[PDB]
Design an enzyme around this catalytic site. Structure first.
Site, short mmCIF file in Angstrom:
data_model
loop_
_atom_site.label_atom_id
_atom_site.label_comp_id
_atom_site.label_asym_id
_atom_site.label_seq_id
_atom_site.Cartn_x
_atom_site.Cartn_y
_atom_site.Cartn_z
N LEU A 179 0.83 -1.21 0.00
CA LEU A 179 0.00 0.00 0.00
C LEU A 179 0.87 1.26 0.00
O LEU A 179 0.47 2.28 -0.58
CB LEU A 179 -0.98 0.04 1.19
CG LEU A 179 -2.12 -0.97 1.20
CD1 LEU A 179 -2.71 -1.09 2.60
CD2 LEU A 179 -3.20 -0.61 0.21
N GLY A 180 2.03 1.19 0.66
CA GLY A 180 2.98 2.29 0.76
C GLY A 180 4.30 1.89 1.39
O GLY A 180 4.34 1.01 2.26
N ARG A 187 -3.53 13.64 6.98
CA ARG A 187 -2.71 12.46 6.61
C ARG A 187 -2.82 11.34 7.67
O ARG A 187 -2.53 10.19 7.36
CB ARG A 187 -1.22 12.85 6.41
CG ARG A 187 -0.50 13.22 7.71
CD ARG A 187 0.94 13.64 7.54
NE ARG A 187 1.46 14.18 8.80
CZ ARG A 187 1.40 15.47 9.14
NH1 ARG A 187 0.87 16.36 8.32
NH2 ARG A 187 1.87 15.87 10.31
N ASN A 188 -3.17 11.71 8.92
CA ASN A 188 -3.30 10.79 10.05
C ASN A 188 -4.76 10.49 10.40
O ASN A 188 -5.12 10.29 11.57
CB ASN A 188 -2.51 11.31 11.25
CG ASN A 188 -1.01 11.18 11.05
OD1 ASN A 188 -0.52 10.37 10.26
ND2 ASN A 188 -0.25 11.94 11.81
N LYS A 205 2.12 -3.81 8.88
CA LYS A 205 3.28 -2.91 8.90
C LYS A 205 4.52 -3.67 9.39
O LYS A 205 4.43 -4.41 10.36
CB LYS A 205 3.01 -1.68 9.78
CG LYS A 205 4.01 -0.55 9.57
CD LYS A 205 3.57 0.75 10.20
CE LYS A 205 4.22 1.02 11.52
NZ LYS A 205 4.19 2.47 11.86
N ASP A 240 -2.09 7.30 14.08
CA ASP A 240 -0.76 7.87 14.38
C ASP A 240 -0.71 8.73 15.66
O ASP A 240 0.08 9.69 15.75
CB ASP A 240 -0.23 8.62 13.15
CG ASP A 240 1.25 8.47 12.88
OD1 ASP A 240 2.04 8.54 13.85
OD2 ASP A 240 1.63 8.39 11.70
N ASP A 245 0.12 14.62 16.87
CA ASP A 245 0.32 14.67 15.42
C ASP A 245 -1.01 14.52 14.63
O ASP A 245 -1.09 13.73 13.69
CB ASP A 245 1.39 13.64 14.98
CG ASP A 245 1.92 13.81 13.56
OD1 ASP A 245 1.76 14.91 12.99
OD2 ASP A 245 2.47 12.84 13.01
N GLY A 261 8.00 3.82 2.89
CA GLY A 261 8.68 5.04 3.31
C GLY A 261 9.74 4.82 4.36
O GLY A 261 10.38 3.76 4.40
N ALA A 262 9.96 5.84 5.22
CA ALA A 262 10.95 5.82 6.30
C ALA A 262 10.56 4.82 7.41
O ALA A 262 11.44 4.13 7.93
CB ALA A 262 11.11 7.22 6.89
N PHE A 263 9.26 4.74 7.74
CA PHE A 263 8.67 3.83 8.73
C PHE A 263 8.85 2.34 8.37
O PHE A 263 8.84 1.49 9.27
CB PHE A 263 7.17 4.13 8.91
CG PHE A 263 6.37 4.17 7.63
CD1 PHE A 263 5.84 3.01 7.07
CD2 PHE A 263 6.14 5.38 6.97
CE1 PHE A 263 5.13 3.05 5.87
CE2 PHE A 263 5.41 5.42 5.78
CZ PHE A 263 4.91 4.26 5.24
N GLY A 264 8.97 2.06 7.08
CA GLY A 264 9.12 0.72 6.53
C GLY A 264 8.19 0.48 5.37
O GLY A 264 8.14 1.28 4.43
C1 LIG Z 1 0.09 3.49 3.06
C2 LIG Z 1 -0.31 4.42 4.22
C3 LIG Z 1 -1.34 5.45 3.73
O1 LIG Z 1 0.83 5.12 4.76
C4 LIG Z 1 1.17 4.51 6.02
C5 LIG Z 1 -0.01 3.66 6.42
C6 LIG Z 1 -0.35 2.98 7.59
N1 LIG Z 1 0.52 3.00 8.67
C7 LIG Z 1 0.31 2.32 9.87
N2 LIG Z 1 0.45 2.86 11.04
N3 LIG Z 1 0.22 1.92 12.04
C8 LIG Z 1 -0.06 0.72 11.46
C9 LIG Z 1 -0.36 -0.53 11.99
CL1 LIG Z 1 -0.36 -0.68 13.71
C10 LIG Z 1 -0.57 -1.61 11.15
C11 LIG Z 1 -0.58 -1.42 9.77
C12 LIG Z 1 -0.29 -0.19 9.22
C13 LIG Z 1 -0.02 0.91 10.06
N4 LIG Z 1 -1.50 2.30 7.63
C14 LIG Z 1 -2.32 2.27 6.59
C15 LIG Z 1 -3.56 1.46 6.69
C16 LIG Z 1 -4.33 1.04 5.64
N5 LIG Z 1 -5.33 0.30 6.15
N6 LIG Z 1 -5.17 0.24 7.54
C17 LIG Z 1 -4.10 0.91 7.87
N7 LIG Z 1 -2.03 2.91 5.46
C18 LIG Z 1 -0.90 3.60 5.34
#
Ligand SMILES: CC1(C)OCc2c(Nc3n[nH]c4c(Cl)cccc34)nc(-c3cn[nH]c3)nc21
Length: 298
Positions: A22-23, A145-146, A49, A159, A141, A25-28
């Protein structure tokens, strides 16, 4: 204070499948996936993630701190952790939000976002924030975007598992590093501005170092063309020097809910009424035995 009795769910790697990225970046890297529990005859759409690839002791620490915060919350307008996978490099599992983040959604669908949706999102965001307030949890934050999109009619805050975005920060945060539930109200005001402008960058072109002076002078974000003085006044109220003078999230729920009852009186969008976003009609939804995480509880 109160003991945190939240349950940390451990998921077996064999129980979930990674479909696509799905994406990255820096976070992974974040993957779209499916979680198929034991022999439950259910397929749960998930987002997985992972910490890029490498395993450094300090990286695992940061990802487990997010798992702690995410597992500690439970609200319809706040993103929750489904579970963790204890592979070589730890994996975070959470409910799939198929429409992505709200910032990308409003930029890509501006021609079909009506007053009802924008105002409903404002209520939903305030409700999540008020839950975070009830739980004594400060976001630090909050931005468009969050905010993840489950369905165009249902958004959830994410986030908050951080507990520098200067252009979303309150004055006490920039000058004295003060983060409160009232400083989140300022960030909420900028988030509403992001939605109302259909994903415009706040203080675009202006460097981050100048923001402190701009705010101290009295200059704020401009009135979005679609905004009546009614909606804009609320945004302006979120951006006051005195934090106690700013609205409370429960006040914001009420105010936006009042507006959501007659959305065309508070937001003037040309082409509104003839606008429609994907809703449960024809093709909104393997695909056999698939259930949402919000409906699956053991
Ligand atoms: C690609 C994008 C839009 O950018 C980053 C990120 C993200 N970051 C996350 N933050 N925390 C997460 C956990 Cl705990 C599990 C999985 C993902 C994340 N999570 C999602 C997402 C999509 N459907 N549900 C969560 N989408 C994105």
């Amino acid at each position: 204070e109160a003991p945190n009795q939240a349950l940390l769910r451990i998921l077996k790697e064999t129980e979930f499948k990674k479909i696509k990225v799905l994406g990255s970046g820096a976070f992974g890297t974040v993957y779209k996936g499916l979680w198929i529990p034991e022999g439950e005859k259910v397929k749960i759409p998930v987002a997985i993630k992972e910490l890029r690839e490498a395993t450094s002791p300090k990286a695992n620490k940061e990802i487990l701190d997010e798992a702690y915060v995410m597992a500690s919350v439970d609200n319809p307008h706040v993103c929750r952790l489904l579970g963790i996978c204890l592979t070589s490099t730890v994996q975070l599992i959470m409910q799939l939000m198929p429409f992505g983040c709200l910032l990308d959604y409003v930029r890509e669908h501006k021609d079909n976002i009506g007053s009802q949706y924008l105002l409903n999102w404002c209520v939903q965001i305030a409700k999540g924030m008020n839950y975070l307030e009830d739980r004594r949890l400060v976001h630090r934050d909050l931005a468009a975007r969050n905010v993840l999109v489950k369905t165009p009619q249902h958004v959830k805050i994410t986030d908050f598992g951080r507990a520098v975005p200067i252009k979303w920060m309150a004055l006490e945060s920039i000058l004295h590093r003060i983060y409160t539930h009232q400083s989140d109200v300022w960030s909420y005001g900028v988030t509403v501005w992001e939605l109302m402008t259909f994903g415009s960058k706040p203080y675009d072109g202006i460097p981050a170092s100048e923001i402190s002076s701009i705010l101290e002078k009295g200059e704020r974000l401009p009135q979005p063309p679609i905004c009546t003085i009614d909606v804009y006044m609320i945004m302006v109220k979120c951006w006051m020097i005195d934090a106690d003078s700013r609205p409370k999230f429960r006040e914001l729920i009420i105010e936006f809910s009042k507006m959501a009852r007659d959305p065309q009186r508070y937001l003037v969008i040309q082409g509104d009424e003839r606008m429609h976003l994907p809703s449960p009609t024809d093709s909104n939804f393997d695909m056999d035995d698939v259930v949402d995480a919000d409906e699956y509880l053991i």
